[PDB]
Ligand binder design. Structure first.
Ligand SMILES: O=C(O)c1ccc(-c2nn(C(=O)c3ccccc3C(F)(F)F)c3ccc(Cl)cc23)c(OCc2ccccc2)c1
Ligand SMILES: O=C(O)c1ccc(-c2nn(C(=O)c3ccccc3C(F)(F)F)c3ccc(Cl)cc23)c(OCc2ccccc2)c1
Lengths: 261, 264
């Protein structure tokens, strides 16, 4: 149990670190997506030629592969940003070193999908630090397994975004996910759960103060961690199929390790 | 939104109905498992299984001849019994019977599996599970040692139960929790989601207050119990994938077609 002023202090700490760690916030993404601004307008990729024009403006292989490799390159960057953020979560670096590895191993994907929703609306997703926007339709029409590889992200995002969280909410939610004591292979569950209890208290107070008319938002947000657990599973099963079919591509060493078991 | 006295009224309402709907409560089951009370008959191997059906005559072992199949089918037979008990309980949740009739059916269809696993934990400890309204006790070791896929079909249930039971919920806690599961607005095919989520919001409010009053020392128990709704969704999917494997491999499973229809 923490005092009210201590919970607000933890929320501000985490929001501050989130701003330092993630270059494209939800606030910035929404300003780009909503428009009515001549300086922040993205170039829109909706087909083959506009993709070709994109490389010239935004700055040898098949289209679906090229786009897929684009996603994994950005996923690796996301893993790096998430790792930097976790180090700022009070108590995280003081945990057993193997458990730090374990928490990140299973946590990064759930966080990537969460923060990907910030860059999405029902029609597409921001790319290249918000300079680009690739339509849902174009992703959904890619060949082989790749077309159906993109769409479930959009389905989750539309539902997650209906909660209308802002970055200060997401900062605490992301921290709660990382500090999950039910990850397989953890050596000391108790010190992880004590941290998550504090983060859960801080999230609960944050949501009540920042969304006072949004009844049981806390409970509804925790119920979304079920949708996250499922999509990660679908994702892993789709990567496995691609590995056994495209024995052309290679994953980044960082990603390879995360998916080993 | 809701006044404190109305939430306690709702909690009391659901507890009373939960006692009427489910014959073997967690309070009663714990008395049997601990040894704090007519000892149950213990099934720990093949020969004691034979004596149990001869003496007690457990209703889910009757006319396949192989033991592991017979026990597996016995689990399905009890599950169908539980579905009717859950259906009756759901009728007492304020607002449920006023929902669209198709949505009532859809909520029960997709919810009963999560509730069956939830309530199965009440009957379990690290060593085994009560059966036949508590008259019997089937050891974990005997279940885990069943051949081919059947052994590995039983053990995940025990693994969930042990972790779920560490929360130390009682029946008044569980009555509201079960109601929350039923009123899930994300079930596929729902026609009118808004009144379902409106009810679930009231039940979540009642659950939160119930837990703070009944477990004041248990920090963020509300959050932790909602996190178990993640495990449940995961265990149910695993379960379904395991039935499919048995169907496509085991051709000693067929029952009378009328039975097959009952247990579809
Ligand atoms: O900016 C960000 O924070 C950000 C974060 C994640 C993705 C993203 N990852 N991802 C994966 O499949 C994935 C996820 C986790 C771990 C590994 C992977 C991996 F290896 F299998 F690739 C996606 C699939 C579909 C869609 Cl629409 C987006 C993604 C992202 O993609 C923007 C994008 C779209 C088109 C061309 C280029 C870039 C952007
Ligand atoms: O009394 C109760 O409330 C109650 C509730 C559930 C079960 C039970 N179902 N089940 C299934 O596989 C199953 C099948 C179809 C649809 C849903 C389920 C499921 F996963 F959701 F539960 C199990 C598997 C293993 C174990 Cl150990 C118990 C069960 C039960 O089994 C007592 C029992 C033990 C041994 C022999 C006979 C009977 C008792």
């Amino acid at each position: 149990h923490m005092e009210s002023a201590d919970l607000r202090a933890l929320a501000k700490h985490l929001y501050d670190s989130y701003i330092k760690s993630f270059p494209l916030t939800k606030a910035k993404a929404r300003a780009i997506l909503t428009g009515k601004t001549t300086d922040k307008s993205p170039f829109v990729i909706y087909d083959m030629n506009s993709l070709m024009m994109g490389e010239d403006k935004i700055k040898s292989k098949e289209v679906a592969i090229r786009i897929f490799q684009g996603c994994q390159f950005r996923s690796v960057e996301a893993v790096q940003e998430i790792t930097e953020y976790a180090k700022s979560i009070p108590g995280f670096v003081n945990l057993d070193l193997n458990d730090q590895v374990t928490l990140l191993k299973y946590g990064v994907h759930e966080i990537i999908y969460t923060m990907l929703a910030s860059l999405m609306n029902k029609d597409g997703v921001l790319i290249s630090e918000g300079q680009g926007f690739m339509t849902r339709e174009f992703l959904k029409s890619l060949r082989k397994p790749f077309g159906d590889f993109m769409e479930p992200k959009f389905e989750f995002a539309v539902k997650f975004n209906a909660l209308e969280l802002d970055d200060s909410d997401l900062a605490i939610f992301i921290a709660v996910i990382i500090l999950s004591g039910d990850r397989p292979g953890l050596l000391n569950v108790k010190p992880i759960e004590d941290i998550q209890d504090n983060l859960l208290q801080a999230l609960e107070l944050q949501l009540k103060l920042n969304h006072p008319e949004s009844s049981q938002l806390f409970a509804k947000l925790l119920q979304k961690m079920t949708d996250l657990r499922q999509i990660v599973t679908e994702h892993v099963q789709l990567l496995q199929v691609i590995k056994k079919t495209e024995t052309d591509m290679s994953l980044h060493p960082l990603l390879q390790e995360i998916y080993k078991d």
